[PDB]
Design a protein around this ligand. Structure first.
Ligand code: CL
Ligand code: CS
Length: 129
């Protein structure tokens, strides 16, 4: 499923991401835009043999099991395929673990390079929330 901007904002709010660990909803929307273009089915392979999955591009070395990343830790205790669902619940639940790991949203490279320090409130402008 490819989300609309305001549709995604509303779903993220309902799942408790607005101000989760101090990050306003606009941060999460911006990160999803530049990680996956709002597409739940996005996958990208990395040089190390791991793959990133879903709307927030969660990595198979640490967070989910895809059966082909040797020494995966599977910290979210889920198959990576669960992160490609039209229902964002598994992606959100796993993202809450990631953002709590010490480095905050810097764990998402596109957030650090394209969202951090910008007017992220713009990503939720005009939405009925
Ligand atoms: Cl932080
Ligand atoms: Cs585990």
């Amino acid at each position: 499923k490819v989300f609309g901007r305001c549709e995604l904002a509303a779903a993220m709010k309902r799942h408790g991401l607005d101000n989760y660990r101090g990050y306003s909803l606009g941060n999460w929307v911006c990160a999803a835009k530049f990680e996956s273009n709002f597409n739940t089915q996005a996958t990208n392979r990395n040089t190390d043999g791991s793959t990133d999955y879903g709307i927030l591009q969660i990595n198979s070395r640490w967070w989910c099991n895809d059966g082909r990343t040797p020494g995966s830790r599977n910290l979210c205790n889920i198959p990576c395929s669960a992160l490609l669902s039209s229902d964002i619940t598994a992606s959100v639940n796993c993202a809450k673990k990631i953002v709590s790991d010490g480095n905050g949203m810097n764990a998402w490279v596109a957030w650090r390079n394209r969202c951090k320090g910008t007017d992220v409130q713009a990503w939720i402008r005009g939405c009925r929330l």
